[PDB]
Design an enzyme around this catalytic site. Structure first.
Site, PDB file in Angstrom:
ATOM      1  N   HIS A   3      -6.339  11.607   9.170  1.00  0.00           N
ATOM      2  CA  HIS A   3      -5.995  10.350   8.504  1.00  0.00           C
ATOM      3  C   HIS A   3      -7.504   9.712   8.526  1.00  0.00           C
ATOM      4  O   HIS A   3      -7.989   8.934   7.586  1.00  0.00           O
ATOM      5  CB  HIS A   3      -5.050   9.338   9.558  1.00  0.00           C
ATOM      6  CG  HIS A   3      -4.983   7.855   8.974  1.00  0.00           C
ATOM      7  ND1 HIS A   3      -3.710   7.636   8.142  1.00  0.00           N
ATOM      8  CD2 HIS A   3      -5.779   7.030   8.895  1.00  0.00           C
ATOM      9  CE1 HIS A   3      -4.190   6.144   7.913  1.00  0.00           C
ATOM     10  NE2 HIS A   3      -4.938   5.952   8.530  1.00  0.00           N
ATOM     11  N   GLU A   4      -8.143   9.660   9.523  1.00  0.00           N
ATOM     12  CA  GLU A   4      -9.541   8.974   9.825  1.00  0.00           C
ATOM     13  C   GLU A   4     -10.473   9.572   8.896  1.00  0.00           C
ATOM     14  O   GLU A   4     -11.404   8.791   8.181  1.00  0.00           O
ATOM     15  CB  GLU A   4      -9.850   8.910  11.038  1.00  0.00           C
ATOM     16  CG  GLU A   4      -9.038   7.963  12.101  1.00  0.00           C
ATOM     17  CD  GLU A   4      -8.961   6.601  11.593  1.00  0.00           C
ATOM     18  OE1 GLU A   4      -9.718   6.116  10.768  1.00  0.00           O
ATOM     19  OE2 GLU A   4      -7.814   6.004  11.868  1.00  0.00           O
ATOM     20  N   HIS A  24     -10.439   8.636   5.210  1.00  0.00           N
ATOM     21  CA  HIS A  24     -10.729   7.356   4.829  1.00  0.00           C
ATOM     22  C   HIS A  24     -12.201   7.558   4.357  1.00  0.00           C
ATOM     23  O   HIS A  24     -12.517   7.044   3.386  1.00  0.00           O
ATOM     24  CB  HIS A  24     -10.969   6.388   6.032  1.00  0.00           C
ATOM     25  CG  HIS A  24      -9.552   5.661   6.045  1.00  0.00           C
ATOM     26  ND1 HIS A  24      -8.899   4.969   5.235  1.00  0.00           N
ATOM     27  CD2 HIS A  24      -8.751   5.279   7.196  1.00  0.00           C
ATOM     28  CE1 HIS A  24      -7.770   4.262   5.554  1.00  0.00           C
ATOM     29  NE2 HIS A  24      -7.694   4.657   6.798  1.00  0.00           N
ATOM     30  N   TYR A  35     -10.169  -1.963   0.493  1.00  0.00           N
ATOM     31  CA  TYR A  35      -8.958  -1.961   1.471  1.00  0.00           C
ATOM     32  C   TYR A  35      -8.254  -3.471   1.527  1.00  0.00           C
ATOM     33  O   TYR A  35      -8.418  -4.283   2.373  1.00  0.00           O
ATOM     34  CB  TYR A  35      -9.780  -1.873   2.844  1.00  0.00           C
ATOM     35  CG  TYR A  35      -8.983  -1.305   3.881  1.00  0.00           C
ATOM     36  CD1 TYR A  35      -8.314  -0.218   3.891  1.00  0.00           C
ATOM     37  CD2 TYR A  35      -8.659  -1.868   5.106  1.00  0.00           C
ATOM     38  CE1 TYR A  35      -7.362   0.606   4.831  1.00  0.00           C
ATOM     39  CE2 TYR A  35      -8.052  -1.378   6.223  1.00  0.00           C
ATOM     40  CZ  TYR A  35      -7.266   0.071   5.973  1.00  0.00           C
ATOM     41  OH  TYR A  35      -6.445   0.431   6.644  1.00  0.00           O
ATOM     42  N   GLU A  79      -4.739   3.674   2.435  1.00  0.00           N
ATOM     43  CA  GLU A  79      -3.821   3.955   3.557  1.00  0.00           C
ATOM     44  C   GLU A  79      -2.769   5.159   3.249  1.00  0.00           C
ATOM     45  O   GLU A  79      -2.788   6.061   4.148  1.00  0.00           O
ATOM     46  CB  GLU A  79      -2.990   2.773   4.137  1.00  0.00           C
ATOM     47  CG  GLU A  79      -3.637   2.108   5.201  1.00  0.00           C
ATOM     48  CD  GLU A  79      -4.070   2.759   6.438  1.00  0.00           C
ATOM     49  OE1 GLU A  79      -3.336   3.432   7.056  1.00  0.00           O
ATOM     50  OE2 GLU A  79      -5.151   2.892   6.497  1.00  0.00           O
ATOM     51  N   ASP A  93      -2.420  -8.174   7.689  1.00  0.00           N
ATOM     52  CA  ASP A  93      -2.886  -6.801   7.530  1.00  0.00           C
ATOM     53  C   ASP A  93      -3.647  -6.436   6.187  1.00  0.00           C
ATOM     54  O   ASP A  93      -3.442  -5.405   5.480  1.00  0.00           O
ATOM     55  CB  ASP A  93      -1.600  -6.205   7.821  1.00  0.00           C
ATOM     56  CG  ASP A  93      -2.135  -4.731   7.660  1.00  0.00           C
ATOM     57  OD1 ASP A  93      -2.788  -4.185   8.317  1.00  0.00           O
ATOM     58  OD2 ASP A  93      -1.214  -3.786   7.260  1.00  0.00           O
ATOM     59  N   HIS A 142      -1.134  -1.491   5.956  1.00  0.00           N
ATOM     60  CA  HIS A 142      -0.430  -0.433   6.591  1.00  0.00           C
ATOM     61  C   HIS A 142       0.933  -0.496   6.507  1.00  0.00           C
ATOM     62  O   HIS A 142       1.869   0.130   6.904  1.00  0.00           O
ATOM     63  CB  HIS A 142      -0.669  -0.634   7.954  1.00  0.00           C
ATOM     64  CG  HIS A 142      -2.212  -0.275   8.187  1.00  0.00           C
ATOM     65  ND1 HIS A 142      -3.175  -1.329   8.366  1.00  0.00           N
ATOM     66  CD2 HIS A 142      -2.899   0.890   8.566  1.00  0.00           C
ATOM     67  CE1 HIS A 142      -4.137  -0.688   8.597  1.00  0.00           C
ATOM     68  NE2 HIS A 142      -4.149   0.308   8.807  1.00  0.00           N
TER      69      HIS A 142
END
Ligand code: CA
Ligand code: CA
Ligand code: CA
Ligand code: CA
Ligand code: ZN
Length: 316
Positions: free
Chosen positions: A142-143, A146, A157, A166, A226, A231
């Protein structure tokens, strides 16, 4: 550093043994020279200064509890690099074999992991909510995804573009989990989330609502928390992705699943060829439909399924 490439052995966060690529020069370092310009793992030593010190070990054996997070961050970064190279013909996150750097043991009791624009960072968790975050392959993927997004579509974002950002990370995080065949599922973060509770996860792609996230555009979050619910609203896209791959009937709309491989091909093409920094949900639908059209034809089942999936979650 400059040295001799070798292979060490260690245990990850979940206690599993695995071999890791290291470099020898007086000490054995967590530096993998077999992938692109290298994969480097650093020790942040409970501080917040980055990147910290390149991980050095005296005997090339990583079985200490303190070593666990480093072993997994190093190993899973490698698996993720392999996925992008073998499946999508992409060399590292920038497409030109950029070095991949990760720092573990960031801060104290830190329940988070992130890409800071230059590298990946993993906290150790507080032992209640999370255990060391690098222990989850979907977390690591997931990271790193990005980073891929930042070098391609560049999705801002915030609000809808951020929710897409996301979802893309959750989608490919999951596809990498399946690629590695490590107890694969359509859940996010299950391996490192709440060690005292089994069967749960942070997010669910198959049923976002299970954890309170929206599974239809009509239930989208419109607040400011957020970063506009990046998210939260990602659940709408995650559900669409799940339907495209696995199929099903959602809110009365039936979708014929086309499989994970095609899902990956369609979204990777959309991400690298059609999405822009300000793309919203409607534009993502258009990008996905066009991508499926390029790859399988305008009258294909693939295109039909993409349209059905977005109709199911209310995205026109
Ligand atoms: Ca050692
Ligand atoms: Ca799993
Ligand atoms: Ca998972
Ligand atoms: Ca749990
Ligand atoms: Zn993310």
């Amino acid at each position: 550093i400059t040295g001799t490439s070798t292979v060490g052995v260690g245990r990850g966060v979940l206690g599993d043994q695995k071999n890791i690529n290291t470099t020898y020069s007086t000490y054995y370092y967590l530096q993998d020279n077999t992938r692109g310009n290298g994969i480097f793992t650093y020790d942040a030593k409970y501080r917040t200064t980055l990147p910290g010190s390149l991980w050095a070990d005296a005997d090339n054996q990583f079985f200490a509890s303190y070593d666990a997070p480093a072993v997994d961050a190093h190993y899973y970064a490698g698996v993720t690099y392999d996925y992008y190279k073998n499946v999508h013909n992409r060399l590292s996150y920038d497409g030109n074999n950029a070095a991949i750097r990760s720092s573990v043991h960031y801060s104290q009791g830190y329940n988070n992991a992130f890409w800071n624009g230059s590298q990946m960072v993993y906290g150790d968790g507080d032992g209640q909510t999370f255990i060391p975050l690098s222990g989850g392959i979907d977390v690591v993927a997931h990271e790193l995804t990005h980073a891929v997004t930042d070098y391609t579509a560049g999705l801002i974002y915030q609000n809808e573009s951020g929710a897409i950002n996301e979802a893309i990370s959750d989608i490919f995080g999951t596809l990498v989990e399946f690629y590695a065949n490590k107890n694969p599922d359509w859940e996010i973060g299950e391996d490192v989330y709440t060690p005292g509770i089994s069967g749960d996860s942070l997010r669910s792609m198959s049923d976002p609502a299970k954890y309170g996230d929206p599974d239809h555009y009509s239930k989208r979050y419109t607040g400011t928390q957020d970063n506009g619910g990046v998210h939260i609203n990602s659940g709408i896209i995650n559900k669409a992705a799940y339907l495209i791959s696995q199929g099903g009937t959602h809110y009365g709309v039936s979708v014929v699943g086309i499989g994970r491989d095609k899902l990956g091909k369609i979204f990777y093409r959309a991400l690298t060829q059609y999405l822009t920094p300000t793309s919203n949900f409607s534009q993502l639908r258009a990008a996905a439909v066009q991508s499926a059209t390029d790859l399988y034809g305008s009258t294909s089942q693939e295109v039909a399924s993409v349209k059905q999936a977005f109709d199911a979650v209310g995205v026109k």
